[PDB]
């Protein structure tokens, strides 16, 4: 089972290498989306 633990490392490396490319490709869009939603949420302050 510790050999299975050792075999987990390549899966972890593949996951990290994929998620790095995913983040570097689509992170500015997600930050913009969070900014849009929080602007919409804070926009309710004055007019209710």
Swiss-Prot record:
Subcellular location: Cytoplasm, Cytoskeleton
Family as reported in the entry's similarity comment: Belongs to the dynein heavy chain family.
Record remark on domains: Dynein heavy chains probably consist of an N-terminal stem (which binds cargo and interacts with other dynein components), and the head or motor domain. The motor contains six tandemly-linked AAA domains in the head, which form a ring. A stalk-like structure (formed by two of the coiled coil domains) protrudes between AAA 4 and AAA 5 and terminates in a microtubule-binding site. A seventh domain may also contribute to this ring; it is not clear whether the N-terminus or the C-terminus forms this extra domain.
Function (record text): Cytoplasmic dynein 1 acts as a motor for the intracellular retrograde motility of vesicles and organelles along microtubules. Dynein has ATPase activity; the force-producing power stroke is thought to occur on release of ADP. Plays a role in mitotic spindle assembly and metaphase plate congression.
Subunit structure: Homodimer. The cytoplasmic dynein 1 complex consists of two catalytic heavy chains (HCs) and a number of non-catalytic subunits presented by intermediate chains (ICs), light intermediate chains (LICs) and light chains (LCs); the composition seems to vary in respect to the IC, LIC and LC composition. The heavy chain homodimer serves as a scaffold for the probable homodimeric assembly of the respective non-catalytic subunits. The ICs and LICs bind directly to the HC dimer and dynein LCs assemble on the IC dimer. Interacts with DYNC1LI1; DYNC1LI1 and DYNC1LI2 bind mutually exclusive to DYNC1H1.
Disease with which this protein is associated in UniProt: Charcot-Marie-Tooth disease, axonal, type 2O: An axonal form of Charcot-Marie-Tooth disease, a disorder of the peripheral nervous system, characterized by progressive weakness and atrophy, initially of the peroneal muscles and later of the distal muscles of the arms. Charcot-Marie-Tooth disease is classified in two main groups on the basis of electrophysiologic properties and histopathology: primary peripheral demyelinating neuropathies (designated CMT1 when they are dominantly inherited) and primary peripheral axonal neuropathies (CMT2). Cortical dysplasia, complex, with other brain malformations 13: An autosomal dominant disorder characterized by global developmental delay with impaired intellectual development. Some patients show signs of peripheral neuropathy, such as abnormal gait and hyporeflexia. CDCBM13 is associated with variable neuronal migration defects resulting in cortical malformations.
Name under which the protein is recorded: Cytoplasmic dynein 1 heavy chain 1
Source species: Homo sapiens
